[PDB]
């Protein structure tokens, strides 16, 4: 086993790292931003153990950012200021009464922070500082993780399992020589337990909870795998778990030409630089996975990156990648199954005016899901024409007493305007909510250049009102988008509402035609089937006083009555003015 440092970057490996960083202007400017941020940190006071409510998490995360940055800077520059400032942070945190195990993410992230510093600075620390820091890792990090009242995340399939197993494993590695049998058992515990959350990447790497939740668990899962690879030369089969390595392709393709994500489920629009993407691109020897991160590294203010507590890992995993001279990905379509299937289609990775469609199957009962099954977003000519409201801020909803996290059919969650199907780009039948027990599979797809498409079976989402419902969405002739619903009624008639949510200005120019205008661009909505419709708009204003305002948005669409015992088609085309 390597001695210290044994986490992520071994004893002499900074020298080769320096060479690749000096050979790339983009990596060099990131490295220098970190070094200059460390110069500022030298003059900033150590953290205090002050919670916000039940959580110390803001402090544990800042501790990770400070100690990772300073420890990286010390190993790369050997500036004494960085060593001493990091040591002061480590001794301060070691003196905390506890690292708040009743919200164990706080302990996990604090343990990772103190462990990286302990390990990366070990050879340059006094025996007294080593002993102080080691005892805090053991007594405030590792020991609470062995307590049944604190470690239920070992049984969970969510981000807590990945994050807590990663953090405690970093502790077990950092203090290995003080308790070898015990640390080996802790490493084994994490390797076995982390398979639970990794199951949800199967089979294709789509992330069931969507764009904003991808970062946390996945990144800590990668910190764990990478540390095992560097320490043991292997990861005990973790990276081979079905679908896990495919999740980098998922995240890359989730960014539309605008730079904004397909923000289904509880998600925001904007992302950030994701250091874990550079690990995936290194493990897979596939720099084409980094096309979106390239834009962030090249264009963004580096101050945006300097809030990222894992930022030095992006440089550790840089793998000699030459950012500016990267080639765009060859594949312009990405499809994945699993609990939340998605299809992500674009006409070009290089043309900023490209048509993009993101569409999803899945279930409203999935963690963080909305009643959005079969919905889509659409961009063209630099404008998002068909949108998704995204999440609503949790704190106000919870403080108001809204039953936000109940996923059952009758839950108050679905009385939140932004979360039910009347505000998403999909069907509502008989004025009903979607069935939360519904699960729409992706049944077929093609990346054919003139007919890129995907199809989902929506029947179980409308089980009580119709016999069958299938939806296809396609990009046709690289020129327009078609949304096609095929509905088979039961022996009862059904009323179907077709909905599109937009921030563009809406003008109904004909009985079957509407013009959307935004940012000096135009898109035309044409209802091809049925031939006879009454175009409508619906307000996006709050319905309940806990609904957030939605200024500048409009719902447009129509309703069709479908007779009993019939097979019917609804077909709508979306044609950019460029087309
Ligand atoms: Ca000693
Ligand atoms: Ca999960
Ligand atoms: Ca409003
Ligand atoms: Mn939504």
Residue numbers in the entry: 34 to 612
Give excerpts from the publication:
Recently, a new class of glycosaminoglycan (GAG) lyases (GAGases) belonging to PL35 family has been discovered with an ultrabroad substrate spectrum that can degrade three types of uronic acid-containing GAGs (hyaluronic acid, chondroitin sulfate and heparan sulfate) or even alginate. In this study, crystal structures of two GAGases (GAGase II and GAGase VII) were determined for the first time, and their catalytic mechanism was further elucidated through the site-directed mutagenesis of their crucial site residues and molecular docking. The structures of GAGase II from Spirosoma fluviale (GenBank accession number: SOD82962.1, 81.2% sequence identity with GAGase I), GAGase VII from Bacteroides intestinalis (GenBank accession number: EDV05210.1, 44.8% sequence identity with GAGase I) and selenomethionine (SeMet)-labeled GAGase II (Se-GAGase II) in their ligand-free states were solved at 1.9 Å, 2.4 Å, and 2.0 Å resolution, respectively. Both GAGase II and GAGase VII are monomers consisting of two domains: an N-terminal (α/α)6 toroid domain and a C-terminal two-layered β-sheet domain. Notably, GAGases are more structurally similar to alginate lyases from PL15, PL17, and PL39 family than to various GAG lyases, which further structurally supports the speculation that GAGases originated from alginate lyases.
The N-terminal domain (Met34-Ala365) of GAGase II is composed of 16 large or small α-helices (α1-α16) to form an (α/α)6 toroid domain. The C-terminal domain (Met366-Ser612) of GAGase II is composed of 17 β-strands (β1-β17) to form a two-layered β-sheet domain with four small α-helices located between β5-β6 and β8-β9. Subsequently, there is an Ω-loop structure wrapping around a metal ion (Mn2+), which consists of three small α-helices and small β-strands, with many residues (such as His401, His403, Tyr427, Glu431, Trp438, Arg446, and so on) on top, which might serve as potential substrate-binding sites. Structurally, the Mn2+ is located inside the long Ω loop after the β1-β5 antiparallel β-sheet, and coordinates with the nearby nitrogen and oxygen atoms of several residues such as Asp and His in both GAGase VII and GAGase II (GAGase II also has coordination with three surrounding water molecules), with distances of 2.0–2.5 Å. To investigate the roles of these adjacent residues interacting with the Mn2+, His403, Asp405, Asp421, and His457 in GAGase II were individually mutated to alanine (Ala), and the results showed that these variants resulted in complete or substantial inactivation of GAGase II. Compared with structurally similar GAG/alginate lyases, the results from molecular docking and catalytic tunnel predictions showed that GAGase II contains a shorter catalytic cavity, which may explain why they can accommodate and degrade a variety of substrates with very different structures.
